A paper describes a structure:
P. gingivalis is a heme auxotroph, therefore it must acquire this compound to survive and cause efficient infection establishment. Amongst well-characterized heme acquisition systems of P. gingivalis is that encoded by the hmu operon, comprising HmuR, a typical TonB-dependent receptor involved in heme transport across the outer membrane, HmuY, a heme-binding protein, and four proteins with unknown function. The work presented here substantially extends our knowledge of P. gingivalis HmuY by presenting data on further structural characterization of this protein and novel data on a second member of P. gingivalis HmuY-like family, Tfo produced by T. forsythia. The comparative analyses of HmuY homologs suggest that not only the HmuY hemophore-like protein of P. gingivalis, but also T. forsythia Tfo may be engaged in heme acquisition.
Numbering used by the authors: 5 to 196
The structure:
Amino acid sequence: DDVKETIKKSKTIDATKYEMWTYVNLETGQTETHRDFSEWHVMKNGKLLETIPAKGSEADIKIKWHIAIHRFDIRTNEGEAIATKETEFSKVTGLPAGDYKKDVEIKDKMLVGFNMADMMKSKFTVAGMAKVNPVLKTWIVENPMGKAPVLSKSVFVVKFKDGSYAKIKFTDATNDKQEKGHVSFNYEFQPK
């Protein structure tokens, strides 16, 4: 009558587009996809050349949400994370103590527009500002160009702004045709 039931589910997110974030509610399973909200910056010959106006805002997101995914970049909604040494959820007892890390801001670094014709002209587009979690980024050990990504086997724990938390184990970074950016994970979420 006073501890809410744990929500144990799997999800598959299409994060293939450089332009987009997918916002994920782990309590309800709802998702929403929106174009990145920053001012975009075209880099040409190693310097900031052109701007593309900022469009929309996070107020356009209707659902509550916990994590968001852009390609293999993972952020939280003002949350914090650790990578445990465990490989199985049953070995992570409760909310572990540890050195939890909040999301960081990265300037003119996250790709929002990328193709080979422009790359050969030394041109590509980045988010003016973006938020990414430096612990969750480690879910990928290696991502060699043209080749299979290598995933961490660690269980992550993420603490959310309402006091909830989840154990998360990532299982796939490609679909069954080996297309990169289809991100799958299992999780166990404790509601408050």
